[PDB]
Ligand SMILES: *[C@@H]1O[C@H](CO)[C@@H](O[C@@H]2O[C@H](CO)[C@@H](O[C@@H]3O[C@H](CO[C@H]4O[C@H](CO)[C@@H](O)[C@H](O)[C@@H]4O)[C@@H](O)[C@H](O[C@H]4O[C@H](CO)[C@@H](O)[C@H](O)[C@@H]4O)[C@@H]3O)[C@H](O)[C@H]2NC(C)=O)[C@H](O)[C@H]1NC(C)=O
Ligand SMILES: *[C@@H]1O[C@H](CO)[C@@H](O[C@@H]2O[C@H](CO)[C@@H](O[C@@H]3O[C@H](CO[C@H]4O[C@H](CO)[C@@H](O)[C@H](O)[C@@H]4O)[C@@H](O)[C@H](O[C@H]4O[C@H](CO)[C@@H](O)[C@H](O)[C@@H]4O)[C@@H]3O)[C@H](O)[C@H]2NC(C)=O)[C@H](O)[C@H]1NC(C)=O
Ligand SMILES: *[C@H]1O[C@H](CO)[C@H](O)[C@H](O)[C@H]1NC(C)=O
Ligand SMILES: [Ca+2]
Ligand SMILES: [Ca+2]
C-alpha cells in the first residue's frame with residue numbers, strides 16, 4: 001500500500017519504500033530524536049540496537065561499534 | 072483520532088499546530104512518552120504503556136463504552 005511508504009518503517013522486504021524519499025526535518029534529519037536510525041533511512045526504538053536481529057534491513061543496529069558504548 | 076494528520080474534523084480543531092510529534096501509525100493510541108498500543112488498551116486496568124499513560128486517572132475519570140458492554 002502507498003500509504004505505508006516513507007512512514008519511517010521497513011515495509012518492503014528490502015526496505016525500498018523508505019530508501020528514496022525526502023528528509024523529515026529542515027536540519028537534514030531522517031528520524032525523530034527519541035529513536036535510532038539506520039543508513040537506509042529506516043528508524044526504530046532504541047532498544048533494538050544489537051539485540052541480535054537485523055531489525056532495519058541494512059542491519060546498522062547490529063554494527064557493534066554502537067553497543068560498545070551501551071551496556 | 073486526535074493529533075494524527077488525518078483531518079477527521081471539518082473545522083480543523085482536530086489537528087492544532089501545538090501538536091506533539093506522532094510516532095504511531097493511524098488508528099493507534101500514542102502514550103505520552105511516545106509508545107503505541109491498540110485502542111482497547113485504554114483504561115483497561117492493565118498498564119499497557121511504559122509510563123502507563125493509558126492508565127492516567129484523567130483519561131478514565133469519565134470513561135464510557137458502547138451499549139453492548141457493561
Ligand atoms: C533535528 O530537528 C529535530 C526537531 O525538528 C530534533 O529533534 C528534537 O530534539 C529536541 C532535543 O532533544 C527535542 O526536545 C526535547 O523534547 C523532550 C520530549 O518532549 C517532546 O515529546 C513530548 C511528548 O509528549 C511532546 O509533548 C513535546 O512537545 C516534545 O515533542 C522534552 O522533554 C525536552 O524538554 C527538556 O529539555 C528542554 C531543553 O531542550 C527544556 O527546556 C525542558 O524544560 C526539558 O528539560 C525537549 O523539549 C524535540 O522534542 C525533538 N523533536 C523531535 C520531533 O524529535 C533533532 O534532534 C534534530 N536532529 C539533528 C541531527 O539535528
Ligand atoms: C517506550 O517505552 C520504553 C519502555 O518500555 C521506553 O524506555 C525508556 O526510555 C527512557 C528514555 O526515553 C529511558 O530513560 C533513560 O534512563 C537512563 C537511566 O535509567 C534509569 O532511569 C530510567 C528512567 O529514566 C529507568 O527506566 C531505569 O530503570 C533506570 O532507573 C538515563 O541515563 C537516560 O538518560 C538519557 O538522557 C540524558 C539527558 O539527556 C542523557 O544525559 C543520558 O546520556 C541519556 O541519553 C534516560 O533517561 C528508560 O530507561 C527506558 N526504560 C525502559 C524500561 O526501557 C522508551 O523510551 C519508549 N519509547 C520512546 C520512543 O520513547
Ligand atoms: C529534507 O526534507 C525536508 C522537509 O522538511 C527539507 O526540505 C530539507 O531541506 C531536506 N533536506 C535535503 C538535504 O534534501
Ligand atoms: Ca515504510
Ligand atoms: Ca536489532
Ligand SMILES: [Ca+2]
Pocket residue numbers: 072073074075076077078079080085086
Ligand atoms: Ca485526526
Ligand SMILES: [Ca+2]
Pocket residue numbers: 112113114115116117118119120125126
Ligand atoms: Ca491499559
